[PDB]
Design a protein around this ligand. Sequence first.
Ligand code: PRO
Ligand code: PRO
Ligand SMILES: [Mn+2]
Ligand SMILES: [Mn+2]
Ligand SMILES: [Mn+2]
Ligand SMILES: [Mn+2]
Ligand SMILES: [O-]
Lengths: 477, 478
Amino acid sequence: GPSFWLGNETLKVPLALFALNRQRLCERLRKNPAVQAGSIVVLQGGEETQRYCTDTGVLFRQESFFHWAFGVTEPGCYGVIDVDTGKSTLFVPRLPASHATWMGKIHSKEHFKEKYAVDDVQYVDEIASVLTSQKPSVLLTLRGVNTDSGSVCREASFDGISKFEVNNTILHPEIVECRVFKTDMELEVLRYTNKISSEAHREVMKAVKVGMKEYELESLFEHYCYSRGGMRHSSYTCICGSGENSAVLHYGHAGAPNDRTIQNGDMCLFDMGGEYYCFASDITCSFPANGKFTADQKAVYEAVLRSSRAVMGAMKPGVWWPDMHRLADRIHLEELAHMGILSGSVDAMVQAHLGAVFMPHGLGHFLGIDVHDVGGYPEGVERIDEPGLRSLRTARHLQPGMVLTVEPGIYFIDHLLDEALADPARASFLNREVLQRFRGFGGVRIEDVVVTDSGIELLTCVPRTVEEIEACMAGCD
Amino acid sequence: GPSFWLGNETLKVPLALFALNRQRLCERLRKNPAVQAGSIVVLQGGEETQRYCTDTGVLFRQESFFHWAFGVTEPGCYGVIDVDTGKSTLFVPRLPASHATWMGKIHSKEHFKEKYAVDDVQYVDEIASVLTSQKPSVLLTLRGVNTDSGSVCREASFDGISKFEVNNTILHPEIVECRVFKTDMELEVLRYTNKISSEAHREVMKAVKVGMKEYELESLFEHYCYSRGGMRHSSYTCICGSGENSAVLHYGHAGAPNDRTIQNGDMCLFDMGGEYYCFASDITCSFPANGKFTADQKAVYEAVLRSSRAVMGAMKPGVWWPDMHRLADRIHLEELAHMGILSGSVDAMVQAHLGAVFMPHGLGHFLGIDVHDVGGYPEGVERIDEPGLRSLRTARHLQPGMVLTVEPGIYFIDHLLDEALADPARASFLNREVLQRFRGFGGVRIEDVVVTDSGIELLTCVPRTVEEIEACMAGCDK
Ligand code: PRO
Ligand code: PRO
Ligand SMILES: [Mn+2]
Ligand SMILES: [Mn+2]
Ligand SMILES: [Mn+2]
Ligand SMILES: [Mn+2]
Ligand SMILES: [O-]
């Protein structure tokens, strides 16, 4: 069948991927006792947007649920699926003649049917008429809360939808659950996205020089990913933190826009991931700006390497993700104690939640079409109200087919350190004379993407040991 | 005073640029008879957004009017200006402690005051209280229609604004008119943006090889502009049309995403422009993929070069922009006839609007903080209901200080050509035997950015003659 492809060495993605997702969704809905026979799933695709009230077009990126189901790149579409038969109908805009002049060829409905391997293609202005003729019991629309953003996903609407019976509660949990488990075809794309991003991270590490601006590496990364990988978008805004900025978890946004000069002695923390055909990647590399770890940098780095490897090794079906987070906490504390930053019983440190002082974020998250992928907190899965753990983007048990980031880190964040030092329950563990040395150190984060099977499959491939990193940065083959 | 700067060789932009804009706006409003004493301009900045319902952040780019007045890069701000005194107050978000962990240092209000060189800084949640204490007569908010998008620019709102008298009609035309005329400081930034983009276009011309995907050059352009120019954004989505795609005016959008393989014999039409600190650039270079103009390519190209230079030579104060468009039409028709594509009286061709068949878009547009900048059609300036001219983004007369693109083009667009051949009023002018040779040719567009004075100043610096282009593509220095 047909494939998405951007030529050269980019990945051919079969449109069968999306057909399988539609089938999987129907199969799941068919098992749901609340789903009426003759129900039709109705999804609305993303529309073109502009900057505020200007005519400056924003590059269109498809809505993630719609993409998962149809893989459609064009704006202004709808897509429906007959639950009982699995029949798919794509609705495309009926374009004006002038489109030929300004935007490109006005493709036929047949062209789109062939392109996307759907069962039928109709025009958007015909959606109410077409659906009316099918005599559905109910339209299943998509409404639910994203547990990372807290935003409500708004459901499909079209002219005349009020004449139909609409249910907006059933679909969201079901399609989310399908997205949690990646098909082999989806896994092929995620192998690719992480391959390209891994290559780009290596190129960045080879290119870093003292005196460069952080954003020079952001540019290089995105350039490698687009020109060599066909990745027009990144999965998220590049985080290129040097020096103290490596302690800032989502550094690189408009408020702190990767504009610091990399200095000799700095640690770099580069968190970047290209996107291909709306599939994510997410990799974080940490390394000395000047290519040689100091003793302190080596110690902090290898502590995070230890937790990273320990977590990956321990991941198997049935493992509770919060246990992996606590495992990383314990290892970090052990290492910080070995370094002399901490003293006392590690057991006592854990009970006092001292790990969260050094790793305030979650150990890792689901990844797929969104970098922070959906389904981390389905009904019945509760967020843990403790430092560190409350920032976990899922509290689920691991199962085969899940795709997760593994991203332990250790940071020296002043307001968290100062808080702990004011608290007698935590201050006793901390050696102020030693900790003082690490103020302004920044931080280290080591992030890989993995797939759960009988254990895990590692999708990311970058230099990780101190020896590997120093060799890579010294221009070694 | 302070400057925006991204280090290395990037431009230092003094925040005084924005203070001058605020001053100019106040000066204009003070002369406006309908503006009440004690009026305060109230602008709302852009807010951070995400992809749909996800937590995937979209890179924040400031709203253009707000940027023009304040040059503020942070999301979630407001800005007010006391008309009578010119006093500026910036309102910044009161951030939670956790911001320190995830986003960066929680800067003081004093930090922002020094950074942006405003008179006062307050937290956003205090805006109603602060404004109440100043006892303004009326709040001047921003509402009006963008004449390129047709969208309504939505006015500032905050909790408790209902307690104030608000006027949303006065400000928009006045601030638009200020934006139409660029200050010396603004011009320095626009020189820079067009310099960097010019350099990037040259690099693209040196790098192009048959067999490459169009998007490889898009990527190279943006990489040059960001890494060397500090241009994190482009002014618009890159249009990298090769072969028949060069006839597609806004090629490169998601529906047609620069994914064609460049072939031997193709003409390339690359319309790309980086953005620096929310100031635009817009350049279009046209050239043969293999670095060698054919006779046909040379002929079409030099015709557009002729109209470009003729328009630039003719641009003066008092000149009506639609007349420049017609001038370009006439030149294109003359040259297509000299090529044997057309035959008969050029006068008759013009009366039949034949030019619009080969150049269906406007000759050029205002440029500034937006690539299609505001103020092309103020009240009293009407859109001309004719082919080609109706697509003009302004029908104003030129005055000193305006910044315009000059972008004539010739394209071979099948449905327009076929319409002309079906039209008895136009069909006789077309020589199909010669024209057939140009089906699938694509098109040529030559775009420069200029500033109006007693004549014009050219901001763009790229190879333009056939000789210059073939030299650039051959890797020549300078
Ligand atoms: O948001 C998260 O969960 C991870 C933590 C470091 C940055 N990204
Ligand atoms: O939109 C416009 O006015 C110009 C015409 C060619 C592409 N940009
Ligand atoms: Mn990341
Ligand atoms: Mn991550
Ligand atoms: Mn252009
Ligand atoms: Mn233009
Ligand atoms: O991350």
